[PDB]
Amino acid sequence: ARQNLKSTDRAVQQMLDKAKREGIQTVWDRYEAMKPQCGFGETGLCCRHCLQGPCRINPFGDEPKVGICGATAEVIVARGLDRSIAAGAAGHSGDAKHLAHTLKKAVQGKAASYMIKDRTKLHSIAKRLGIPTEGQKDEDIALEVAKAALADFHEKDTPVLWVTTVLPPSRVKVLSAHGLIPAGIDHEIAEIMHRTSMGCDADAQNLLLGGLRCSLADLAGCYMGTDLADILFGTPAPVVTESNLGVLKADAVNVAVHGHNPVLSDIIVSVSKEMENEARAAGATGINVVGICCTGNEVLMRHGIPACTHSVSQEMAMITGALDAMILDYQCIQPSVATIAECTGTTVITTMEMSKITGATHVNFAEEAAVENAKQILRLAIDTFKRRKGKPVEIPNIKTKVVAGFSTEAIINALSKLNANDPLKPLIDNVVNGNIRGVCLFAGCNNVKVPQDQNFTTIARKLLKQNVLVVATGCGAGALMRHGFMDPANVDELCGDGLKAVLTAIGEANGLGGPLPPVLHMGSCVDNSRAVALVAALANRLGVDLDRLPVVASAAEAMHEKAVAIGTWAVTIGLPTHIGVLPPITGSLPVTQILTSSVKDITGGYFIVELDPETAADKLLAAINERRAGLGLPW
Amino acid sequence: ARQNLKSTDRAVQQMLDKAKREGIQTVWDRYEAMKPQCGFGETGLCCRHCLQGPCRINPFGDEPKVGICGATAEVIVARGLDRSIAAGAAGHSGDAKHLAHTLKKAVQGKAASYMIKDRTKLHSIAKRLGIPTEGQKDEDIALEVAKAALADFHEKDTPVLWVTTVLPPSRVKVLSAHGLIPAGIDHEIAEIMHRTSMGCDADAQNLLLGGLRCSLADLAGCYMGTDLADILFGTPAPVVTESNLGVLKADAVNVAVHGHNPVLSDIIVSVSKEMENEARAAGATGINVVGICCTGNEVLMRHGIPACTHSVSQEMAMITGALDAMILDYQCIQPSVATIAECTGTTVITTMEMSKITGATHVNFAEEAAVENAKQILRLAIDTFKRRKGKPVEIPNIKTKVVAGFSTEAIINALSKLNANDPLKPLIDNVVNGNIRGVCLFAGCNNVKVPQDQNFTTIARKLLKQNVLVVATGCGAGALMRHGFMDPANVDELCGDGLKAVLTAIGEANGLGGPLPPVLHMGSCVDNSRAVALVAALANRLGVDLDRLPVVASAAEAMHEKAVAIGTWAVTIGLPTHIGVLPPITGSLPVTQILTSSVKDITGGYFIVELDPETAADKLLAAINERRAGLGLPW
Numbered sequence A, B: 001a002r003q004n005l006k007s008t009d010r011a012v013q014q015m016l017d018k019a020k021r022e023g024i025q026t027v028w029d030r031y032e033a034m035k036p037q038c039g040f041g042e043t044g045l046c047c048r049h050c051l052q053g054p055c056r057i058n059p060f061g062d063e064p065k066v067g068i069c070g071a072t073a074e075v076i077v078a079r080g081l082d083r084s085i086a087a088g089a090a091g092h093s094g095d096a097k098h099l100a101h102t103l104k105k106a107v108q109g110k111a112a113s114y115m116i117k118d119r120t121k122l123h124s125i126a127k128r129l130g131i132p133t134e135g136q137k138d139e140d141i142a143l144e145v146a147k148a149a150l151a152d153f154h155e156k157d158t159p160v161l162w163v164t165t166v167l168p169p170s171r172v173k174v175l176s177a178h179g180l181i182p183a184g185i186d187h188e189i190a191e192i193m194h195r196t197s198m199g200c201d202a203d204a205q206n207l208l209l210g211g212l213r214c215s216l217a218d219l220a221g222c223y224m225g226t227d228l229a230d231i232l233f234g235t236p237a238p239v240v241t242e243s244n245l246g247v248l249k250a251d252a253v254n255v256a257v258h259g260h261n262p263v264l265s266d267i268i269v270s271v272s273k274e275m276e277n278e279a280r281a282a283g284a285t286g287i288n289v290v291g292i293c294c295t296g297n298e299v300l301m302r303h304g305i306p307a308c309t310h311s312v313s314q315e316m317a318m319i320t321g322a323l324d325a326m327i328l329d330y331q332c333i334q335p336s337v338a339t340i341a342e343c344t345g346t347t348v349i350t351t352m353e354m355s356k357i358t359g360a361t362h363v364n365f366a367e368e369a370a371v372e373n374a375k376q377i378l379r380l381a382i383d384t385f386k387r388r389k390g391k392p393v394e395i396p397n398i399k400t401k402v403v404a405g406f407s408t409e410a411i412i413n414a415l416s417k418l419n420a421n422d423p424l425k426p427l428i429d430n431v432v433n434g435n436i437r438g439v440c441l442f443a444g445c446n447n448v449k450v451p452q453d454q455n456f457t458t459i460a461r462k463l464l465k466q467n468v469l470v471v472a473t474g475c476g477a478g479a480l481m482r483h484g485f486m487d488p489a490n491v492d493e494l495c496g497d498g499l500k501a502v503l504t505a506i507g508e509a510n511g512l513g514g515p516l517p518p519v520l521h522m523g524s525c526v527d528n529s530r531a532v533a534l535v536a537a538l539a540n541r542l543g544v545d546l547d548r549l550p551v552v553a554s555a556a557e558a559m560h561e562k563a564v565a566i567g568t569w570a571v572t573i574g575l576p577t578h579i580g581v582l583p584p585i586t587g588s589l590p591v592t593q594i595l596t597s598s599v600k601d602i603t604g605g606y607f608i609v610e611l612d613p614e615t616a617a618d619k620l621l622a623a624i625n626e627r628r629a630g631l632g633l634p635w
């Protein structure tokens, strides 16, 4: 079998060979077994919103042409897309809500394992929300910030402040004029579910305006999530670590943290250090915490925990035979891991009441009992490592060097070595003179339909040669880190002369043997909000709105409903937004035209749907260069 | 064509003939054009929760057997059902939330067309919520009640009070022990959308427990909706009116109110009386307000507005040629009405920002401008009536007499004529001696898959002969009213001797020429909460929980996601609950077994899935009689 058609990651290819000869079914095998997939669903032309269904519409030809209730293709497509945005919003904001309750508990004395770690961040958030700090205790400031976070989930006298206080006033003004500012995060999710139910909203433009507003609720959830985690766990600064399956170690207890919420994994990290000697006694060198998906990104950014794999290839960590435990909370966890665990000997542990997997061991995690629960979990991992004594494992000897931890604050600090009191100016200077063509954010997942990482790396390589400053989050950062894009030793090979000069100048001014890495890792998926903060700060420094800046986003291999919500709010805040996988919209030309074209007249952003990555790179460059020409810059 | 295979309503049959020869496509024609429908969707074995999809699972045979991410049939079925419950919850609770904001505006001086109409109801609700009334102004009590309603949508220090204060403490105790009490209405909707997104909750029992809890959020939305509308518009008392298309009048301006929220339609009713002479000048006898769906039920219950049609047959009102306007807010409105309007000359008017229909005229309704907006809308209706001057119309000369308005308070009052200080005892007496075998609630929609009204009337006839006291809401009440079941002249023909004696005894004691009607109309779909109040009051009077009472529910022809939510909370509060249409669950035997059987061990309720109405009637009788035998009663 040609494993490079499944993944461009050589360590993943090696594990696919091992899974094949051991007879362990993979996500790629389940994909093959699903082909050919349903064309009504692929195009968006299916509706199950009531029990008169299921209804479908032929993309071309004869009947059925319309849903049983009269719903058109346009309504059906818009309604399905709207529910996906609401679902993504519900995940990101459920993540943030957990962080909000955790911060509240922490400063109320209910969970001593948690504390205010970043006082500076606490105060800057309180100030941005209009929460007075002068004369207040940190605990009381934090209490107020947690209360404001929870208040943004419902209607109140103010709109969602994690939208209106994080975007430039001019952007908020154009969104308010279209009625797009969310009134409450869960309020908007519920309204989507209402308006998309049978016999309700049946106008594509009305429905899609609702989706834009719900995407801003998703953005608020992301930004709140990043804010609260930085308070609780620290704002990331530049770190050095490694990535890919070669970060596992046969002689250690290998513990993957997988899912999204750092309330769990940050505790695993610190507790695993406390139990090192208990692990030495079981015959291990120690506990080797490694990261998968966003929760791994979280502990990579803050602690330098090596990333072992991401997204579509998550099963391959287990296939090595050396993964003793996989500790889960929620989101983007293939449920197959619970059945594969029986073949690989991995102990799979769920921790969240609303995210169980049949066959997995459930260990309830309560923030009030975080250390005790973590030790109960890590002891299951040690028992498992003992059980594989004298078993051979196959860990591919494949890893990359990863410089990461580029929070927006860290980026501002790095630039400040070139201009202390105007740190954004050196970046803008080099945009203006052409050393930086523009900025591209890579975000989102892998998708089994796309050879793993192929779009991310193909697009990134073209952009970097054209002097684009590339930043990345989530499993887009995962793809780029696993292929060397976060190793500064690759600046010469990857970057155009102008971008190299800039990365080198900044790196030299920060006391480094050389340049920043080719791609700046800005964090998890909620940390797409960091890219927003940076671009908003650039917008404010220049006196223009985001839809005039040479900034684009690419969800190059998108999968999750969360990635659709992110892409939609990237469009809503004004960015040309590439998506490298077909969302289910092509069954409706009017919807596609709204999302790819007429939405420009509303928010200035627009979707770029392009499945061929070389073509996508050209379209993203043209989008960047059209912005440059709109600022009167050469390009 | 055999029109009685489409509808058992003779007036609907006549209009189907007219639509056929005029070439106007109907919901039944769009259904025919959809056959055969997708079996993966019918069985629940389809998932589009991420962009790796669509995924499907063969009910039998070979691959695909599992979703691409590893999701089993059980997870896929549970996840889809959970989203339908959340969507229904979002509709009923969005309805209530609108009523809450309307009551707040009214007692804040912002909307003088609205007022506290039922002071007694206001105070009894405030008392039930623990809101002190002693020494308070009505406006301040109402302000507090509106604030408590809005607070139930989010997390707070108390759970959802429109659950915990409306069910017996013993029922709340068994639900709390299973973790089923909702924490906030929109909180639960969002959590469903989160836990059902890709890579999250993947255990059928865990997922379905979540659905039970979200259904209680739906129940809270229903009960809040009924409570607030009764405050604002009056608690219903016995009324006499008529139903079916024969209530339209060629010589009047015929105005249908259609949708769900009475904040709009109650104003249409009163304003339409003010503009009677303006309508006389356009050559009409007056304005003939008639009802469709739940908003018609609302004005039927409170004002005696005749019901013209319901649910699946809503288009047929327009086909008469005499419907000058159809005034819409949201929910259960077939979007086809906007295109049919062009053939029939009806003016279709949308009023709610989140519920537009392409091609319909949008007139924004603001509660602050209710009278002015209503007159702008009614003037469009008058213009339309003038345009059909000299046109023939075909109004089937078919209607029934309808006694309705049986709120739980009205039922208690009627019984109190037999026992002033213990009004529930005469009912319990006649349950015990066998004159009343038990109680059956008919609820929910019509569904195009079922010949309209056939399940409702077949089941009702068998139950009434067996002395079951039948109550009904929504389009179940609509089906029964259109077939004479709310006409007391039909008691002799329809009711067993024991039930007749009881209906006659109660009717005689309320100064009537004879008995109560064969079926008690308890209101709209949110007014299913009234049936809950009655059964809860019976439970409390007897000292037992609802799952020991001889009470059942039948969603005999269910359609909307709302009907699934209602059925699920009927099971959750302890009722044997028939559904007469296949929900998409049969692709998973474990899910079906949970919902039809093992949930008995959790809540005491259970689903009875039975598509044959004679068999369903037998199963509902057995369920009733098993309850009777559990109380030690003969049966």
Ligand code: SF4
Binding pocket: A047, A048, A049, A050, A051, A052, A053, A054, A055, A067, A068, A069, A070, A071, A197, A198, A199
């Ligand atoms: S909402 Fe309309 S289009 Fe969707 S399943 Fe029901 S009848 Fe069909």
Ligand code: SF4
Binding pocket: B047, B048, B049, B050, B051, B052, B053, B054, B055, B067, B068, B069, B070, B071, B197, B198, B199
């Ligand atoms: S969530 Fe799993 S089952 Fe559903 S579409 Fe995505 S891969 Fe397929």
Ligand code: FES
Binding pocket: A038, A039, A040, A041, A042, A046, A047, A054, A056, B038, B041, B046, B054
């Ligand atoms: S018909 Fe295949 S997705 Fe519904």
Ligand code: FES
Binding pocket: A038, A041, A046, A054, B038, B039, B040, B041, B042, B046, B047, B054, B056
């Ligand atoms: S395959 Fe038909 S409902 Fe999805």
Ligand SMILES: [Fe+3]
Binding pocket: A259, A260, A293, A294, A331, A332, A474, A524, A525
């Ligand atoms: Fe993620």
Ligand SMILES: [Fe+3]
Binding pocket: B259, B260, B293, B294, B331, B332, B474, B524, B525
């Ligand atoms: Fe209804």
